[PDB]
């Protein structure tokens, strides 16, 4: 199927308390593979998956250089942002960045992304055509004018359609066994009396990958949303995810309800009944 590569970075100014903190992580699909922390003593792009360890010291030098340089650019960007908005140096501000590409199954380009948020809000983004920019506000108009004049979009598109998709293909091989794997949910159902009049029916999805999943409840083969709780899909800590869905059910009714479970790893959907 499709695959994605992403880099996520976060700069946080620390007013009165030294230089900004810079953390960047890289992901292929739902798996992390590298990290860099400005405060760490090693000062290098470190490996965060087994399949990236088979890379030469050229790789680790190039990537260290590039990430270390981006930290300085964003460090300066925070100073620029303050002045643009005339904001007190006393307050801490955050700058986040998303970068990456999507490929189809055949390995070809599908999509590219480059975008920035200032204090949790959209700041600037490369549009899908990868030729133009969306500024969020007057402050980002200034940035966007710079970037047009300098032709950042042309550089980014070339990287996005080439070096990124190539990089992605390459990664999907080196960790073929971690990355092209599909782990189906191990599913089950529990039951918790609340009153002698009501009960909680809880439907579980466990040790699955990738993270996308759908859990539904049904009363007599017909959908139900009333009195249902659906927690957020969560990391297990081993490269797999968990999720659960519950319904409050009046006593004696338990068997009118079914749980439905859809995941790429299931050859066929699952139906669970108490």
């Amino acid at each position: 199927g499709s695959h994605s590569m992403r880099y996520f970075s976060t700069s946080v100014s620390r007013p009165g308390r030294g230089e900004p903190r810079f953390i960047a992580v890289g992901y292929v699909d739902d798996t992390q593979f590298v990290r860099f922390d400005s405060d760490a003593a090693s000062q290098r792009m470190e490996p965060r998956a087994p399949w990236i360890e088979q890379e030469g010291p050229e790789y680790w030098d190039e990537e260290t250089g590039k990430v270390k340089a981006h930290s300085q650019t964003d460090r300066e960007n925070l100073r620029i942002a303050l002045r643009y908005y005339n904001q007190s140096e006393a307050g801490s501000h955050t700058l986040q960045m998303m970068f990456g590409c999507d490929v189809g199954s055949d390995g070809r380009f599908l999509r590219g992304y480059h975008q920035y948020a200032y204090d949790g809000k959209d700041y600037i983004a490369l549009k899908e055509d990868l030729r133009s920019w969306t500024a969020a506000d007057m402050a980002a108009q200034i940035t966007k004018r710079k970037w047009e004049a300098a032709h950042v979009a042309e550089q980014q598109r070339a990287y996005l359609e080439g070096t990124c998709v190539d990089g992605l293909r390459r990664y999907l091989e080196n960790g073929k066994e971690t990355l092209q794997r599909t782990d189906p949910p191990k599913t089950h159902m529990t039951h918790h009396p609340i009153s002698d009049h009501e009960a909680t029916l809880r439907c579980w999805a466990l040790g699955f990958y990738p993270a996308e999943i759908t859990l539904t409840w049904q009363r007599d083969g017909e959908d139900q949303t009333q009195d249902t709780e659906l927690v957020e899909t969560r990391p297990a800590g081993d490269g797999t995810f968990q999720k659960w869905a519950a319904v409050v059910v009046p006593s004696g009714e338990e068997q009118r309800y079914t749980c439905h479970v859809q995941h790429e790893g299931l050859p066929k959907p699952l139906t669970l009944r108490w």
Binding site: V25, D37, H93, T94, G120, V231, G237
Partner: protein
């Protein structure tokens, strides 16, 4: 800059089996800004060998982190997560339920 309080889940990597090796998890998501404090507790006392994943974020720019520690569950033992963050008036404590 709006600020988002974290959503918190405490739970184990595998279904609990008293006297067996497991990992205790606390997952904090949907929050902003990124500075957060997260402790795991055993019978009310902070647990020390606690590690965490690298800071990342979702589509809506909100942050998430996994905190995890290796542990052995028993019938008797109590566990909890304790989370503080700018948006929280006082630390929030979330008891571990082998079923949620």
């Amino acid at each position: 800059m709006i600020q988002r309080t974290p959503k918190i889940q405490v739970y184990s990597r595998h279904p609990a089996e008293n006297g067996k090796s497991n990992f205790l998890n606390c997952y904090v998501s949907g929050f902003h800004p990124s500075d957060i404090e997260v402790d795991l507790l055993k019978n009310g006392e902070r647990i020390e060998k606690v590690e965490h994943s690298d800071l990342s974020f979702s589509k809506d720019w909100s942050f998430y982190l996994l905190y995890y520690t290796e542990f052995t569950p028993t019938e008797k033992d109590e566990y909890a997560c304790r989370v503080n963050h700018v948006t929280l008036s006082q630390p929030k404590i979330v008891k571990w339920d082998r079923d949620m």
